[PDB]
């Protein structure tokens, strides 16, 4: 198709580095059905080309219905290229965070990431996007496309499209100058303290702006510009370390809680033990009951004020990973903790009753692990990577049939049952 | 003659050169065959004689098919495969023939000649150039190049399919009815049209081929059912697969493995059990084509199971979108699993067997959800849905399980099959300690250099063990101690362990392991009738189990 008018930024992969090689997974008929009916018309319309088998790359592809929406949108899974794609601070394109969205006390996310296919992709990097839709059985070579445009879901988009949002959000910032706008991947987040009616129309108002910029490069494109997601983070709430307040102690609750306050000593580092275990003297039976000494009441309330205040030599770094840790507590309790460094813990909390409780844990991780990277990227500007509490291969098994987030986090496995879930039981 | 296919680009991978394995001269009738081979080839363009100026070379040897006085030339591309380009390599699997629909009409024809009628890249031709030896070692020798894909090259398969999916694809939107289905040699072709018609637009197909230089030979056009596709032979409302029949050979070459496990590996898509492990392992190294390996005895066993597997015939039927998919699943012991995927009863899509993931502790419930996440994924593969799950387990049972499990675990919609044997819980450990229950604190300890260890407890009742062990680590006390608090309590227990390698490993649940002291400790929990297990961190004043660990410290 036409060169594109639009005059393509230089990308390059990271020193040393080569393109994506990733299989692609073994898709549901409806959403190779979907896949295809998709990429027709973003063929027809120059967004990709068809390619051959002599492009050696690939990055597996996928689709996905957001909250509430009958329309399937395609979702390639770039995880591999974002880890082998230059840096884009040294181009002087990296995207800063406002440490004021979390504050707001409404937030809608907007998927903005069908404006990015208005602008053309460096030629020599289309082949690194490479992807393949794969046929039922086999029974067929898979259709392989790459990308003229800038893709959703890679992390190029943004950075290269960030100069063009700025002119199309100019205005709207001008007229509301205390309204934050954050742009994460495909995502717009849009925070006001308005009343919610207001707030609400605001968004629209930024929507028309969006949509009054399609006119000047038509490819429709209101696909998901449509769709508002509210947060309210100004109430979002952290799960602190608790501990049982009860009128009578047996042996074996004495000694649950001298295990969490060993435990939490590694956190907090003025936490005493001492007078607890010598009401543990001898050789008991867990049910005896134990009635605490003056010394031992005394060491529990200081151990519960220490707990109330947070955690020391805590500072979000930018440049380190966020970790996110997740247990099953059970009843469709989930819990979890985010941090750089082990025990400097940046946010605890608890989800329950959350879509799947009490019937499916896959779906219930799932939306945990949506809650918890856009609280992330509320709050500090990037996805965590999760370390889960399942089998590879069932979370691999069915975690696309719940995904509704047009971006991935990383992931790795946990296999050893830990003591972290009493602890934040 | 020239041919209309465009040549699909093809580079080295970078910075590579040509060839470096040069030409054998060989006996006077083995070259006296090659000329009138190569004049031929040259005949119909495959090959051309070039320049004095091509610095490369790539080697051959000559083996007979079947065995008449007519030489098959044998050429080793594995060099030239090393430094080409990678080909991104579309299909990983094959198709089953149980995901076909019926098709009123149904055709077979063959392209497997096709391979010689697609040009290759001519920048890349120059790497695959070859010499006929002199005869008498006196005239230079007369140099080739292949102008198309040769066979065995790691670009062909890739190429040619490229090839025939754009050869095909305006024949396609001119029929989008007509169903063509590609795989190498063949070309499955059906359709829903009355016969006289059907057969009308298979000519019109196999014309269309013939103008791009394709051409689809009668003898193999196959208009009787059984149609084999893919050695699988379609019938109107079943197929079959024919016994596979493996060599028999008193030694074997690296051709004859390679041949061996890429025939191993096909079938095993269709038959259960099928081992390629060690075999493969014989075709490590740089070891060329002719030459002699030693079958190792894992090898034979790997072998000869194969071939009693082999033994028989499969059968299944077509998909019917219109209806269900259901699997229904087995027990069969020893860590096996059987599995029928069907929609109306016992008319079966597809049976096989899962084998338990190998590990130190597992239990049935595990190996249920695993077979049923591979169950679900080869469905996906095959029919494109998850089926419905027949399940020898009941939904108490599972519901106890994955609700107190501690990860996240899940089986999509299933019903109960009572099928014995049922899979079950040997055991639930309490939620809160035991009243009126001995309370037994456990612990171990181990000499790093010597081996030698204690494993003890004490009770509230005042009663003690300690036990001197031999050849014993830590971790193995830790668990002595546990196994000794089982054997000499009553049939309800409270039990406080230090060690969280041990109460991991009762935390994962296991109903059989490798170990046997894990396996004793197993068969304690089974005759119990309540046992609460907790935890305390060592050495932290902690009254009983200070006094198990003084017990079983070193004297
Ligand atoms: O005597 C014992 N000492 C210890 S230390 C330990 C882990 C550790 C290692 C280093 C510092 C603190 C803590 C486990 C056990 C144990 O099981 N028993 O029995
Ligand atoms: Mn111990
Ligand atoms: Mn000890």
């Not at chain 2, 010499?131 to 230079?140: C, D, G, L």
């Not at chain 2, 399940?391 to 089986?411: C, N, R």
Request: proline share 7%.
């Amino acid at each position: 198709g036409p060169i594109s008018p639009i005059e393509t930024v230089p990308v390059k992969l990271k020193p040393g580095m080569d393109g994506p090689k990733v299989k692609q997974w073994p898709l549901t008929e409806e959403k190779i059905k979907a896949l295809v009916e998709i990429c027709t018309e973003m063929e027809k319309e120059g967004k990709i080309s068809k390619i051959g088998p002599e492009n050696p790359y690939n990055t597996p592809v996928f689709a996905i219905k957001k909250k509430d929406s009958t329309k399937w949108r395609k979702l390639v899974d770039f995880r591999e290229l974002n880890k082998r794609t230059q840096d884009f601070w040294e181009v002087q394109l990296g995207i800063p965070h406002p440490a004021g969205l979390k504050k707001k006390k409404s937030v809608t996310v907007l998927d903005v990431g069908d404006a990015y296919f208005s602008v053309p992709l460096d030629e020599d990097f289309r082949k690194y996007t490479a992807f393949t839709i794969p046929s039922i059985n086999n029974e067929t070579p898979g259709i392989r496309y790459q990308y003229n445009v800038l893709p959703q879901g890679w992390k190029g988009s943004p950075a290269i499209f960030q100069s063009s949002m700025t002119k199309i959000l100019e205005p709207f910032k001008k007229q509301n100058p205390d309204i934050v706008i954050y742009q994460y991947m495909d995502d717009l987040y849009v925070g006001s303290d308005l009343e919610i009616g207001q707030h609400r129309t605001k968004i629209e108002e930024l929507r028309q702006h969006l949509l009054r910029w399609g006119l000047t490069t038509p490819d429709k494109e209101p696909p998901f510009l449509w769709m508002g997601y509210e947060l309210h983070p100004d109430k979002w709430t952290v799960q602190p370390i608790v501990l049982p307040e009860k009128d009578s102690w047996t042996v074996n609750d004495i000694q649950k809680l001298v295990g969490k306050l060993n435990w939490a000593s590694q956190i907090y580092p003025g936490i005493k033990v001492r007078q607890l275990s010598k009401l543990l003297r001898g050789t008991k039976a867990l049910t005896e009951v134990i009635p605490l000494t003056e010394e031992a009441e005394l060491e529990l309330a200081e151990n519960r004020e220490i707990l109330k205040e947070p955690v020391h030599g805590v500072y979000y770094d930018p440049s380190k990973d966020l970790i996110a840790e997740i247990q099953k507590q059970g009843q469709g309790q989930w819990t979890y903790q985010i941090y750089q460094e082990p025990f400097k813990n940046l946010k605890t909390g608890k989800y329950a009753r959350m879509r799947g409780a009490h019937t499916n844990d896959v779906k219930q991780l799932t939306e945990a692990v949506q809650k918890i990277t856009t609280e992330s990227i509320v709050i500090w500007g990037k996805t965590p990577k999760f370390k889960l509490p399942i089998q590879k291969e069932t979370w691999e098994t069915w975690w696309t049939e719940y995904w509704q987030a047009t971006w991935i986090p990383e992931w790795e496995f946990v296999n050893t049952p830990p003591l972290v879930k009493l602890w934040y039981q | 003659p020239i041919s209309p296919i465009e040549t699909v680009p093809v580079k080295l991978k970078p910075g590579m050169d040509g060839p470096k394995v040069k030409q054998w001269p060989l006996t006077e009738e083995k070259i006296k065959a090659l000329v009138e081979i190569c004049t031929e080839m040259e005949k119909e363009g495959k090959i051309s004689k070039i320049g004095p100026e091509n610095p490369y070379n790539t080697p051959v040897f000559a083996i007979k098919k079947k065995d008449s006085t007519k030489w098959r030339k044998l050429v080793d591309f594995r060099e030239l495969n090393k430094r080409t380009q990678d080909f991104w390599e579309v299909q990983l699997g094959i198709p089953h023939p149980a995901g076909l629909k019926k098709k009123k009409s149904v055709t077979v024809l063959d392209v497997g000649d096709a391979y010689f009628s697609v040009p290759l890249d001519e920048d890349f031709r120059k790497y695959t150039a070859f010499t006929i030896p002199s005869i008498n070692n006196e005239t230079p020798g007369i140099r080739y190049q292949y102008n198309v894909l040769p066979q065995g090259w790691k670009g062909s398969p890739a190429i040619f399919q490229s090839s025939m999916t754009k050869i095909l694809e305006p024949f396609k939107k001119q029929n989008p009815d007509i169903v063509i289905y590609q795989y190498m040699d063949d070309l499955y072709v059906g359709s829903d049209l009355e016969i006289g018609q059907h057969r009308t637009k298979i000519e019109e197909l196999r014309q269309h081929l013939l103008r791009w230089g394709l051409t689809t030979p009668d003898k193999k056009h196959q208009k009787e059912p059984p149609f084999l596709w893919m050695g699988y032979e379609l019938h109107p409302d079943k197929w079959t697969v024919q016994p596979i029949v493996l060599p028999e050979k008193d030694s074997w070459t690296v051709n004859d493995i390679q041949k061996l496990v890429g025939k191993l590996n096909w079938a095993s898509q269709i038959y259960p059990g099928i081992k390629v492990r060690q075999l493969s392992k014989l075709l490590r190294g740089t070891k060329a084509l002719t030459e002699v390996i030693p079958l190792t005895e894992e090898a034979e066993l790997e072998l000869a199971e194969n071939r009693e597997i082999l033994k028989e015939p499969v059968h299944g039927v077509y998909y019917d979108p219109s209806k269900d998919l259901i699997a229904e699943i087995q027990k069969q012991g020893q860590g096996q699993w059987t599995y029928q995927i069907y929609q109306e009863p016992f008319k079966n899509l597809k049976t096989g067997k899962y084998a338990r993931m190998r590990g130190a502790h597992t239990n049935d419930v595990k190996q249920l959800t695993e077979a049923v996440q591979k169950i679900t994924t080869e469905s996906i593969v095959i029919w494109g849905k998850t089926p419905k799950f027949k399940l020898p387990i009941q939904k108490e049972t599972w519901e106890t399980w994955w609700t107190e499990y501690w990860q996240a675990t899940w089986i999509p919609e299933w019903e109960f099959v009572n099928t014995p044997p049922l899979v079950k819980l040997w055991y639930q450990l309490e939620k809160e300690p035991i009243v009126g229950a001995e309370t037994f604190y456990v612990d171990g300890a181990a000499n790093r250099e010597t081996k030698l260890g204690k494993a003890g407890y004490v009770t509230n009742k005042g009663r003690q063990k300690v036990v001197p062990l031999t050849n014993t680590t830590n971790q193995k006390t830790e668990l002595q101690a546990i196994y000794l608090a089982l054997q000499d309590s009553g049939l309800e227990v409270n039990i406080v362990t230090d060690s969280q390698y041990a109460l991991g490993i009762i935390q994962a649940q296991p109903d059989k392991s490798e170990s046997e002291l894990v396996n004793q400790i197993i068969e304690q929990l089974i005759k119990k009738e309540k046992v609460y297990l907790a935890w305390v961190p060592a050495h932290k004043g902690i009254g009983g189990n200070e006094q198990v660990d003084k017990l079983v410290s070193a004297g």
